[PDB]
Amino acid sequence: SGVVQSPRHIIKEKGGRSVLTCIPISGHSNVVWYQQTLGKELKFLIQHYEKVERDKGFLPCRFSVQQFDDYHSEMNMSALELEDSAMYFCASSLRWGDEQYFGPGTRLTVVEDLRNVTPPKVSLREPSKAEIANKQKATLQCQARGFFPDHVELSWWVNGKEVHSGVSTDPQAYKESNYSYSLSSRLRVSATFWHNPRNHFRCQVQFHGLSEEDKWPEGSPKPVTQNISAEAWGRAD
Amino acid sequence: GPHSLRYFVTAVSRPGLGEPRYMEVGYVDDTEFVRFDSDAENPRYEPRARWMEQECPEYWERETQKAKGNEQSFRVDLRTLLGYYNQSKGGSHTIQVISGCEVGSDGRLLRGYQQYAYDGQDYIALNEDLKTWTAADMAALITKHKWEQAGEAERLRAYLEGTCVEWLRRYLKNGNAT
């Protein structure tokens, strides 16, 4: 019932190549590819109506797209450069000019060296004893650092349930070094809630790393896609 | 803007006595260099400058196909705006669209524009931010809504920032004396 895009996240070495694919809504005949760079913007790339190109702009000659018999279109991307690291969206209107329906988008990051890909390090620190005594409002800081590239999605899980109320994750990852980023998020909890030793707090960080197809030189574990979390229980004092 | 490339699009409607006279005219800087005209015995994109006379032969087929598509697209709009404004089906009308980009000495886009006009009065236009529309009346609010749900702003922006500048840079190279 919605536009499907795959894959959601890929890490490719500079000069490599990978294909992005997009399944439009059934019956839709107008597909259009948009690219959005890391700096907030939206760039029109290509428009294909009824299996043929209709309008083109900003689409490099290195990229080639084409519709198929089932109207699904794929984007061939070759000779990848670091500047190609961006998010690629796929809208599919029924007819040209009709309301378009976007897809989830594909997060492509082109890296110089695949060895620099490294999973994060997640650790959360309990609220300060000073603040809880004065404000009765505990703040739980979570620190995920040492990862590359910027393919993390942090979420909070209290009592086994994902919660959006009270959390305040940093908007962007802060790059510490050339090949290591760091993200911080803090969840506020009332002192009476945090002081209950029965409440389980968990800050998980989903990391989208190398694919299985991508070869890995041994001597170290492959930085495959994975979510690691640091948990802590409520404390009473 | 030392160098600009514009396009004037006119779709004069005649309800009876035939079909709408449709024609496109372009000006590198302020000199006309290409032209289309529906009311020709065998209409084709024709050059109006010596430097355009030598252009690629496949270029003329690419643009002539595009015009006939725009001709059919504007034939539907003429009918649509009779339904928007609740106008009679037997009155002559005119849609004027001017599209163009002017670039400075540095070769980067100074300002891009696209001004629609129905029967002399401004209808809709693309703002200076190249992302938002500015509609002039209630019906233009309907068209503005369509282009927003359709994503026309991103498509048109990519034309003025990209396609228009590259081909203007290409036209000026042809234009200089061989």
Binding site: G97 | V9, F74, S99, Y159, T163
Partner: peptide, 8 residues
């Protein structure tokens, strides 16, 4: 080149 005008 010229814009590919679509419906309004």
């Amino acid at each position: 080149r010229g814009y590919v005008y679509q419906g309004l």
